[PDB]
Amino acid sequence: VHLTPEEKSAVTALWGKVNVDEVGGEALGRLLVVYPWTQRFFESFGDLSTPDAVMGNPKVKAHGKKVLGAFSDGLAHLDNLKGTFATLSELHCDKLHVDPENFRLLGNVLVCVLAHHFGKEFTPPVQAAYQKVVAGVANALAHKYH
Amino acid sequence: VHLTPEEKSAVTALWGKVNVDEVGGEALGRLLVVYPWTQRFFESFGDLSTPDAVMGNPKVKAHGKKVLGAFSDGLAHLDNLKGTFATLSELHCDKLHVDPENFRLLGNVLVCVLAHHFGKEFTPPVQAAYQKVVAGVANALAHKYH
Amino acid sequence: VLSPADKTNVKAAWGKVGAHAGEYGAEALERMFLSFPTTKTYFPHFDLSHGSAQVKGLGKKVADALTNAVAHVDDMPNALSALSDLHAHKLRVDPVNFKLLSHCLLVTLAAHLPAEFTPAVHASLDKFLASVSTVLTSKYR
Amino acid sequence: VLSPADKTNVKAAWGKVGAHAGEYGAEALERMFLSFPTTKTYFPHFDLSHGSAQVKGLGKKVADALTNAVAHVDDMPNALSALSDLHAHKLRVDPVNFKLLSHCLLVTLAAHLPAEFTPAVHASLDKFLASVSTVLTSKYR
Ligand code: HEM
Ligand code: HEM
């Protein structure tokens, strides 16, 4: 916000190495462990009693896949995140009642997961590019709130 | 990041009653009292040892006048806050080294001062309009940071 | 830490508020819903329109909690423990929102306390509401 | 609060850092400067270029402070008393920035501790850095 050409290239290059289903399950699981108040949306998901139970929960993993799948597709539209996520924004406000701070916490966790997964390849400049991305996506998802 | 027609009207109407010199001194003074770490930018301003010393400090009053004067000028350009404040944004980053969080704190104190001064006339809808404005001005002043 | 002067200031201001506390609580919530619309995400079951009895009712409870906190300013964690439990484990309001209601409570007090809301009292009230917010979020994880 | 399990988790994870303390501290600072440029407003007097002696030195001191805190996790306010004085009375870094460095420290640890950065340990580390930040800002007003 805004990404330089080199930053866009860095983002795209790293993401091409990502298993979206796995990274999605891991990020959502970690969100519910690290920031447990985020469990408030998932009472229907069954066992969230321990960190191992959250991480291994098939419904948590399923939702992680769904969310990060949408995130992944969004990376093809870095120059139009608001347009890309407008309808999802309206949904998250009007029907799901998700406080947009949740999007920011998820972004934080995603950055930590990428760092964990990629180690030294997740260099300070690569992180900086991803911070722009997760801020952009959270801002886009928050934009139609009212 | 946009005011409604009623919101712009509400902003302009209240501001017609604001003594920008007085309110500016009051808001800057209160910033230094309520968040005393902000005194870090005013080492040369003299006595800031007690609330009464801060509020009566002629350099605090004079600078408050200048700051809120620039704020006031910006209310004539609500659709173009970024452009209006670009030059001051660069100044605050490159020369003054002021963390933009300070702009947010000053916004909060200003809203408090308007509430204190105007009382019931500072209705919840009027406050909401002013919250958009102070967020907009802070974001504008932060925009050229790098 | 709240200083002896902070505590004196808080008791003075809240004392002047007196019997209006419940009204001011509802006003603060209304200010919050209007200024910071994301806070409305916690209230899909409320009518949030101006004058709403649901907002008035919550406003009274919030105000009573603050009265109790003032009455127990030296033992706030225990006084607010049931509310810390409720917010941490049931309501699960993201901690960022407490600063938003705190600001709106300040603004409400400022709008009703022409004489009392001096810079020193403003500072003490801000510290006090931040302290209450910290207690209310202390059991979140 | 840090649970007894949090304390065990932090001591294990930070113990692994060992002699890399300086390196990781400096990396966390660089990550912060790059990701959150407003934080550079506190360092107009530093060469912030990669590999700078000033950033390396501060990195080491930040890390040793964290080591001190981990070793005295039961009484961090006393252990960090001089540093909380320094930040409150002299440096006067806005409290919002502590979350930013904390996040960058957390990222640095994740990038360097593949075996030890489990979900539970991630939670404990995040809580610990938040607690340290709280202590460091406790005297601000
Ligand atoms: C990058 C951030 C996110 C993206 C791109 C995203 C995307 C999505 C998508 C595509 C859906 C399905 C919508 C539909 O069925 O029409 C969804 C549903 C949902 N999302 Fe989000 N989401 C994000 C973050 C979050 C977070 C952080 C939370 C809560 C902590 C959340 C809570 C929910 C809930 C509760 C549902 C409904 C799930 C269900 O009915 O099974 N979302 N989201
Ligand atoms: C709406 C927000 C603000 C606006 C529009 C603004 C505008 C200005 C202007 C116009 C000047 C130059 C005055 C002159 O002509 O001499 C100035 C200087 C300055 N500002 Fe800002 N300001 C804002 C907020 C702040 C805040 C919150 C801080 C710090 C807490 C700050 C720190 C400073 C400093 C240290 C100077 C130089 C003072 C000196 O000469 O010693 N500003 N600002």
Ligand code: HEM
């Ligand atoms: C000074 C800060 C706060 C205080 C003192 C406070 C106090 C209270 C009290 C006393 C209740 C009633 C509990 C009961 O009926 O058993 C309550 C409920 C509730 N609060 Fe908090 N609260 C605070 C901050 C917040 C914030 C910032 C939010 C969200 C933005 C929030 C959301 C809620 C919700 C959704 C309920 C349940 C209302 C209902 O469904 O009836 N609170 N709070």
Ligand code: HEM
């Ligand atoms: C985990 C949080 C933090 C820890 C443990 C920490 C620790 C330290 C330590 C040990 C020193 C050196 C003290 C000395 O040499 O006497 C220091 C100095 C300093 N810190 Fe903090 N700090 C933290 C957060 C921050 C943040 C977030 C900022 C700003 C973004 C900051 C800005 C500074 C500055 C400007 C100095 C002076 C550097 C110099 O000129 O030598 N600190 N800190």
